[PDB]
Design an enzyme around this catalytic site. Sequence first.
Site, PDB file in Angstrom:
ATOM      1  CB  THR A 267      12.788   1.910  12.680  1.00  0.00           C
ATOM      2  OG1 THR A 267      13.602   0.831  12.944  1.00  0.00           O
ATOM      3  CG2 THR A 267      11.822   1.672  11.600  1.00  0.00           C
ATOM      4  CG  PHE A 392       6.898  -0.738  18.780  1.00  0.00           C
ATOM      5  CD1 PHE A 392       7.926  -0.801  18.101  1.00  0.00           C
ATOM      6  CD2 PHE A 392       7.271  -0.250  20.217  1.00  0.00           C
ATOM      7  CE1 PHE A 392       9.240  -0.349  18.514  1.00  0.00           C
ATOM      8  CE2 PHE A 392       8.321   0.188  20.715  1.00  0.00           C
ATOM      9  CZ  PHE A 392       9.316   0.273  19.741  1.00  0.00           C
ATOM     10  CB  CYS A 399       7.585  -3.793  15.753  1.00  0.00           C
ATOM     11  SG  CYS A 399       9.690  -3.706  15.391  1.00  0.00           S
TER      12      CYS A 399
END
EC number: 1.14.14.1
Length: 454
Positions: A267, A392, A399
């Site tokens: 990521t 996110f 996240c």
Amino acid sequence: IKEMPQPKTFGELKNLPLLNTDKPVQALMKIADELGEIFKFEAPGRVTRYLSSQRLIKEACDESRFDKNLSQALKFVRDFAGDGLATSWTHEKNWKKAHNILLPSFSQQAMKGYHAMMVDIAVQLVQKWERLNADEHIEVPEDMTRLTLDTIGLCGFNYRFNSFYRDQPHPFITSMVRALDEAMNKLQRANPDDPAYDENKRQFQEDIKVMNDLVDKIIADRKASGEQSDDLLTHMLNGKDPETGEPLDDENIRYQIITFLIAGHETTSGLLSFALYFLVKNPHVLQKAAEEAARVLVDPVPSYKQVKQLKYVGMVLNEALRLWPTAPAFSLYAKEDTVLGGEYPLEKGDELMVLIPQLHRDKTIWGDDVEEFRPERFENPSAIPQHAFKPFGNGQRACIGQQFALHEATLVLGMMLKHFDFEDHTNYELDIKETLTLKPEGFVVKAKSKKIPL
Ligand SMILES: CCCCCCCN1CCC[C@H]1C(=O)N[C@@H](Cc1ccccc1)C(=O)O
Ligand SMILES: C=Cc1ccccc1
Ligand SMILES: [Cl-]
């Protein structure tokens, strides 16, 4: 009520062959451009609906109506990430237990404790580029992946992958990358029980054993030493969930470590790669970001507080996440019967996919300049409507790594802009490779040292 559009069909295979491509998310983005804010996608035995507009995604993000679904992608990753945070259902005991235990280790306050280890890896990157010979070039996603993997190894469990010492990945990483490839390939594997794939299955089980053996050994070695290094592993061996009063068991700790290493590899490295791509394509933005880096980063080593002062660098990163969110989708299921957007009736259990790159191109939110790289569109974030910017994910299943990733990416990009001028010497044509995530394949630059010591 209205019936939703659907892309072209292939007889009994329905829409499935549309995803028989090395770039299936990019294919879905082109379908969303043709069909609009919502379309149905059918395959043998399954249906889902792809959402692209803020109008509908704001409703999908209502946690009273929708919860996180494991996409088939995440169900295949679960064969090695187990019931770690990203591949668990919200209703599994181990999700809320690990969430409660780990959340304070991932807060903005916690970043002060990771900063020195992040600087260690960031300085390795700067030194590598300072040591290149004239007209050598940089392989950008390769070096960003070396950095982000090593950062999470050193913060995750005090382990040095030493990626800047290697051409060939650490063996653990060879196995993890091949397992991720197997997981994503199985989404488009026609008849999986064909003996043609016995080799793929044997290789997958060997790769799982390699990952488990290193991680289980690191856990067993720490437990034995009693060493109290302030890393996520120490937090996980010691921590108790306030709700259950239980700590995580050693198997779940292993799945959390594997999860963190997947995210660290896949990521942040994509975000840094895209950010540098956009800076070299937009020299006026590069100049503004470089001026900020020079004004703020006045010491040989950036401090925690100086990274927080790199406001324009933070806007560059958000604008890169807007155009190419490197984790490009998430999945939801309807908790009960409900109507989406006053128009689309859903039954309990019905699945949705959020196409984050398409959300981020909604002209009703961003205006007509939606394809332009303009970090200044983040200057007044209170003006952005709810659920318009979702790189996110959503809600309690967003996240856990957001503050970690943005601190590391702001630090590194700030140091890169302080220390080097950059040239797009090949006039690189964006080519986006799809793994678990999106990254710009073959992106190379040249970096001329400003000759500022560390
Ligand atoms: C960070 C990782 C994000 C994962 C993104 C999903 C990445 N998929 C890769 C292919 C397209 C995309 C997706 O829409 N797949 C869904 C639906 C699906 C299920 C079975 C076969 C094919 C597709 C899924 O996996 O359920
Ligand atoms: C989308 C995030 C993610 C992170 C780690 C493992 C699997 C998925
Ligand atoms: Cl047909």
